[PDB]
Amino acid sequence: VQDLLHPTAASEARKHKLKTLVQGPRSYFLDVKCPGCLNITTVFSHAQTAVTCESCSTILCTPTGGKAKLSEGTSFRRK
């Protein structure tokens, strides 16, 4: 019900990440502010590890199967 040349981004963004026209990722980065210190660390959105901070080695996020759970001590910038 559409052409394969330019589909809309509304039609595009609902698709699976492999079956797109030009395959590209969806996962992102963000900066982590935990007030034990004031340094931010770039933590990838899917953990696979128990991640702690730079100096205040406590926690930043917990591993899941999918998206990691930022353990509530965070406001963040997705850049």
Partner: peptide
């Protein structure tokens, strides 16, 4: 209500880890 309650109780959080 609710979000401030989370703020203070998890401030006993930052005294609960540290």
């Amino acid at each position: 209500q609710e979000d401030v309650q989370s703020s203070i109780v998890d401030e006993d959080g930052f005294t609960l880890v540290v």
